[PDB]
A paper describes a structure:
To obtain a deeper understanding of the mechanism of CDK2 inhibition by 1, we determined the co-crystal structure of 1 bound to CDK2 at a resolution of 2.62 Å. The co-crystal structure revealed that 1 is bound to the ATP-binding pocket, consistent with the ATP-competitive mechanism of inhibition. The 3′-OH group of 1 formed hydrogen bonds with the amide backbone of Glu81 and Leu83 in the hinge region of CDK2. Notably, the hydrogen bond with Glu81 is unusually short, 2.6 Å, suggesting its energetic favorability. The structure also revealed key hydrogen bond interactions between the 4-OH and the 9’-carbonyl with Asp86 and Asp145, respectively. These critical contacts in the ATP-binding pocket with the 4-OH, as well as the 9′-carbonyl, explain the potency differences observed with the intermediate/shunt metabolites produced by BGC HX1012/HX1035. Indeed, the binding mode of 1 was similar to that of dinaciclib despite sharing no chemical similarity or conserved pharmacophore-protein interactions. We characterize the activity of 1, revealing it as a potent ATP-competitive inhibitor of CDK2 (Kiapp of 44 nM) with selectivity for CDK family kinases which induces G1 phase cell cycle arrest. Epimerization of the 4-OH in 1 to afford 12 results in a 50-fold reduction in potency. Consistent with this prediction, 11 is approximately 900-fold less active than 1.
The CDKs are a family of kinases that are critical factors in both the control of the cell cycle and protein translation. Depending on the cyclin-bound state, CDK2 promotes S-phase entry (cyclin E-bound) and drives the S/G2 transition in the cell cycle (cyclin A-bound). The misregulation of several CDK proteins in a variety of cancers makes them attractive drug targets. We apply the approach to reveal roseopurpurin C as a potent inhibitor of Cyclin-dependent kinase 2 (CDK2).
Residue numbers in the entry: 2 to 36, 47 to 150, 163 to 297
Amino acid sequence: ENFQKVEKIGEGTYGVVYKARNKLTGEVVALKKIRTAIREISLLKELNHPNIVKLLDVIHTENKLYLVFEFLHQDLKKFMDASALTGIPLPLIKSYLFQLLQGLAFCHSHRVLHRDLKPQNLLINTEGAIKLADFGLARVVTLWYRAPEILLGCKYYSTAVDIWSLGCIFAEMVTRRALFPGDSEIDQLFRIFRTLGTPDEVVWPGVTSMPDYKPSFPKWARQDFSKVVPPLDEDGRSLLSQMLHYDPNKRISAKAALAHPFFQDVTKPVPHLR
Ligand SMILES: CO[C@@]1(C)[C@H](O)C(=O)C(C)=C2OC(=O)c3c(C)cc(O)c(C)c3O[C@@H]21
């Protein structure tokens, strides 16, 4: 093959990922080797936006599926773990969040959903830019970033499932701690309820008719938000609480969130990566 596999960079759910070199172009790429979908996947090649990792080639040869992506060196999770002692500067936080929303706003306007948006698959660079990886393919794994409508067994997700995840990552960058670090579907769901209170028909019309909603859930009270994400300012908390509305239809759109006053003073600073 016209691909020379430098080294393995991770295992996925259907295939493995390699850093590779395209023998034609001398082009360094992320290469996913997996063992109707091919047609549905191929469409993501058309998505071109500065905050989407580019899907370069979908190869279906030797009855096998290779996906080739734009390569980047570091993911947000490594950059969070590295920036643990000092914490990410708020201007860099604000930049990444504004950028990720422009990506979601782009994906959503083309009817494209991530579903499993988490820090591991947010890639960064020396220009101080952040890109969405593994976007629109999905169509033990951590549940830390799973929307409450998924955990309650809704089959028919909307774009609001990704706004939730971004809100969780925003909190994590600010606090240096997963917001809802759950270790089972019930544990995850109960961690959200311990912070935002158990939902009801008042705040979430339909919630009692969800597939996996029990009337036998405990009734927890909502926690004040200055205790959850300090010392984030009132704009940040305001934007976070609109991103974490229980009711997906009340949950703020990526487009609407770009016009939030939190981004009035937004800049593009440049990180120190190793
Ligand atoms: C550091 O990046 C990793 C290895 C990341 O630790 C990780 O968790 C997985 C599973 C990856 O998977 C990827 O598929 C991936 C894609 C689509 C593009 C890309 O440029 C890169 C570099 C990719 O590697 C990432």
